[PDB]
């Protein structure tokens, strides 16, 4: 009764035996592609040719054809950086936990579950349940102030 249980022991964080590094392998994350991936570029003000060249430089650094062709889908730069950060955070959601990292808990598991149910663009849409007290005097003041400031 009460079956015998064993675990496959592979969730430990990477680089645990820490085999020494290759000389000249710390400047590998400062290549043009590796920098553009951490920064991301914007299509609307980098141009067409230059955006193509930068996306090509980044692609041949990624090893996953899925992510390689999913690169830089937004026209904004910070949005591209955020899309890549979200891809990597989703990939690292469940990868770092278990044997040699803090085991899963209700708070962290609830967090990673609410992260998994989010599609790309990183948000699940909330439905209306309440609305503020519409004071169109406040709205008129806000619009007048915003327009005045936009003018001068």
């Amino acid at each position: 009764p009460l079956d015998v249980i064993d675990v496959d022991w592979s969730g430990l964080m990477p680089k645990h035996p820490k085999e020494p590094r290759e000389p000249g392998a710390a400047l590998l994350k400062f290549t043009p592609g590796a920098v553009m991936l951490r920064v991301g570029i914007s299509k609307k003000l980098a141009g067409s040719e230059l955006f193509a060249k930068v996306k090509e430089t980044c692609q041949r650094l990624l090893e996953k054809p899925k992510d390689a062709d999913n690169l830089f889908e937004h026209e904004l730069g910070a949005l591209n950086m955020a899309a890549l950060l979200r891809k990597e955070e989703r990939a690292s959601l469940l990868s770092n936990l278990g044997p040699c990292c803090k085991a899963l808990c209700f708070r962290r598991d609830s967090a990673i579950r609410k992260q998994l149910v989010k599609n790309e663009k990183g948000t699940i849409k909330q439905a209306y349940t309440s609305a503020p007290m519409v004071d169109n005097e406040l709205l008129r003041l806000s619009l007048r102030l915003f327009k005045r400031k936009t003018t001068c």
Binding site: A25, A26, L27
Partner: protein, 184 residues
């Protein structure tokens, strides 16, 4: 200017302060009543409502207390029967030592995990980690210094090629002047 109306404001402020202090006294008496009146006496202590779970706790504890007490009296009656045997005294002293060791071993296991040795092993592991992080970042700084020295050697090669170009063009100008001053 005049002090009449200002002193009037003063004394009406004093009466406002008196009203506020009396309201505060009312609040203090009220909170004292609200926070200290709840005290259970034998009248209610003899008719206390408890959950079914707490009542089952009480019943289980009573039952197992009765069973343990019964076995206890029984064992302590059996203790008075057994007579002194040499091996019995050997076992008595043996198990006295056994108990004392059972206690001293936990008293020492708590020292091994809460005493000087735990702090020392913690400092040791933290110093190992600090040194390993310092060295793992000095390795990256060494790679960046490799970058800088490659820049040095590239600039030095450019200096050499520019010096050879300057030398050859300078001697070329010298010879061209020494020719075309007598020829041209």
């Amino acid at each position: 200017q005049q002090q009449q109306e200002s002193a009037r404001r003063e004394n009406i402020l004093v009466m406002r302060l008196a009203t506020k202090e009396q309201e505060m006294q009312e609040c203090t008496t009220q909170i004292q009543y609200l926070k200290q009146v709840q005290q259970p006496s034998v009248a209610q202590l003899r008719s206390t409502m408890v959950d079914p779970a707490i009542n089952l706790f009480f019943l289980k504890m009573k039952g197992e207390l009765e069973q343990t007490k019964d076995k206890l009296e029984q064992a302590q009656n059996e203790l008075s029967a057994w007579k002194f045997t040499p091996d019995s005294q050997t076992g008595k002293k043996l198990m006295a030592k056994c108990r004392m060791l059972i206690q001293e071993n936990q008293e020492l296991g708590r020292q091994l995990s809460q005493g000087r040795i735990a702090q020392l092993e913690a400092e040791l592991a933290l110093q190992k980690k600090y040194s390993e992080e310092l060295k793992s970042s000095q390795d990256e700084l060494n790679d960046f210094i490799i970058q800088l020295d490659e820049e040095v050697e590239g600039m030095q090669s450019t200096i050499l090629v520019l010096q050879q170009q300057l030398k050859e063009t300078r001697q070329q100008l010298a010879q061209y002047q020494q020719q075309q001053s007598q020829a041209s």
